[PDB]
């Protein structure tokens, strides 16, 4: 779990739990739910 609370959520990037707690970040700017995070697990791994 590398998604600390350093930041809440980016624009059009909410998040909700599934049948259990699969925190998936919802995307309103693009309309889509994703497992990764739009503010920590995006196109960046340096």
């Amino acid at each position: 779990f590398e998604i600390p609370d350093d930041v809440p959520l980016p624009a059009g990037w909410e998040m909700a739990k599934t049948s259990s707690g699969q925190r998936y970040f919802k995307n309103h700017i693009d309309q889509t739910t994703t497992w990764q995070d739009p503010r920590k697990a995006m196109l960046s791994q340096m």
Binding site: T18, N27, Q31, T32, T33, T34
Partner: peptide, 10 residues
Amino acid sequence: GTPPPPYTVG
């Protein structure tokens, strides 16, 4: 492994 939810919006 599993696909994301069906998404929603109020």
